[PDB]
Amino acid sequence: EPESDVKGRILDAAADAFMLRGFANTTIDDIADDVGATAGLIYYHFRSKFDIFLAVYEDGMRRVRERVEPYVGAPGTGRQRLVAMSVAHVENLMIDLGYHHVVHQRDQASTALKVRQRDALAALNELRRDYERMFHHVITEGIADGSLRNVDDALATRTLLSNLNAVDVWYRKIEGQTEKEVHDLASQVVDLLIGGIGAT
Amino acid sequence: EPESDVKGRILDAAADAFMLRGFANTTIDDIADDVGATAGLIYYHFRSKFDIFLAVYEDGMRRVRERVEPYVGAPGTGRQRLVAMSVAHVENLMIDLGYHHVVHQRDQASTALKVRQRDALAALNELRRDYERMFHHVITEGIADGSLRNVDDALATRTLLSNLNAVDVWYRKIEGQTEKEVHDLASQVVDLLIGGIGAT
Ligand SMILES: Nc1ncnc2c1ncn2[C@@H]1O[C@@H]2COP(=O)(O)O[C@H]2[C@H]1O
Ligand SMILES: Nc1ncnc2c1ncn2[C@@H]1O[C@@H]2COP(=O)(O)O[C@H]2[C@H]1O
């Protein structure tokens, strides 16, 4: 098996474990069990549980950006782009739920992080801010072009992003739910966020 | 000082401490420090940190219900009632943010809870479900009366509740912000959730 494929299975297992039990209670042994190996294989690829967390965060950010970024500068009104970006964001959340949990999962901790880990975390947090700024940019454009309501752009951006991510309060993966079924659920959610619940 | 007033100060301090540091890292000493007393005063009123958590949850549920319930059966369309209920919910979140954090804050824990504590927790969780069901009832009514869009009532309820609570991602209390200023911010948030961000 290619080493990149083994790493991917580790990240998949770790993302789901961190989601299920939380970072603090997840162990390297949990992750090893879920990929069919020993702790030694995990440590060969990642030196610590926090390094695995950082790698999950990095991969989650890459995946969501690759799904959403193509729409930001595409032809269309602000609303058309915002709908496409928002559906893609929610679809990514629904497909890669464990990665989403990590991306969105304290300064006061029991042990110090390594210097390298703190630098990597800060860079990932800035990447997440850069990603969220794409929504602010499109919302500002849509307010200006009239496809969105004349509301406060900062409040609308913070509200919309919190709402897209709040799908994680209730959504759980269902085995055998199809790609279109997940896309359709994401579309229904975004229809409520952009079109509202109130009539006319 | 009346004992009920001392208890209220303890709950206020604990709600803010649990918000700031989390339940696990908060200590009885933290709470004692914040009310100007010793751990002994805290233990006189509440036997354990989890008992304080339960009392915060209970008081948070009482406060939100008292603010929101009067609207559920009041005269008005489903949308009119939903707007009033939602503004009241968000205002309660903004005013009593630490209580809100507790109400919305694992089965696998390091120590067993007392029997009495597990019973109390289960009852509080059912009270929270009863509260959220008021929104489902009004959304169903508003779909039927045409004041809300013909959308799926279960999805709309889960989405709306997650969105009302997701204000906590970005909102922080500002000292000296007035009651009307907080009410107005809550109204702006609810305007986005009910009316949508998309134009016309
Ligand atoms: N993958 C999914 N597809 C469709 N509906 C879902 C999915 N995940 C969660 N839900 C809905 O969210 C609800 C949350 O509580 P329930 O498990 O009672 O029922 C759930 C479904 O109605
Ligand atoms: N109480 C509040 N009143 C008005 N705006 C707020 C309040 N709390 C948070 N915000 C907004 O939410 C933003 C979150 O990040 P900032 O602190 O950069 O700036 C904040 C404000 O724009």
Author numbering:
A (entry chain A), B (entry chain A): 6 to 110, 113 to 207
What does the paper say about this structure?
The mycobacterial repressor, DarR, a TetR family regulator (TFR), was the first transcription regulator shown to bind c-di-AMP. Recently, DarR, a 201 residue, TFR regulator of a putative MDR transporter, Ms5347, in Mycobacteria was discovered and represents the focus of this work. Structures of TFR proteins reveal that they share a two-domain architecture with an N-terminal DNA-binding domain and a C-terminal inducer binding/dimerization domain. The DarR N-terminal domain consists of helices 1-3 and the dimer domain is comprised of helices α4-α9. In DarR, dimerization is mediated by helices α8 and α9, which interact with α8´ and α9´ (where the prime indicates the other subunit in the dimer) to form a four-helix bundle dimerization module.
We next obtained the structure of the Rhodococcus sp. USK13 DarR-cAMP complex to 1.44 Å resolution. The structure revealed clear density for cAMP molecules bound at each dimer interface, in the same location bound by c-di-AMP. Unlike c-di-AMP, the cAMP appears to be tightly bound to DarR; the B-factors (ave) for the cAMP is 33.5 Å2 compared to 22.6 Å2 for the protein and 36.0 Å2 for water molecules. Interestingly, in this structure the cAMP is rotated ~90 relative to the nucleotides in the c-di-AMP bound structure. Nonetheless, the contacts to the cAMP are provided by the same sets of residues that bind c-di-AMP. The Arg165 side chain contacts both the cAMP ribose and phosphate groups in the DarR-cAMP complex. The cAMP adenine N1 and N6 atoms are read by hydrogen bonds from Gln184 while the adenine N6 and N7 atoms are specified by the backbone carbonyl and amide nitrogen atoms of Arg179. Finally, the side chains of DarR residues Trp177, Tyr178, Ile181 and Leu192 make hydrophobic interactions with the cAMP adenine moiety. The distance between recognition helices in the DarR-c-di-AMP and DarR-cAMP structures is ~43 Å indicating that they also adopt structures more similar to the DNA-bound state. Because cAMP interact with residues from both subunits of the DarR dimer, it would be predicted to function as a stabilizer of dimerization.
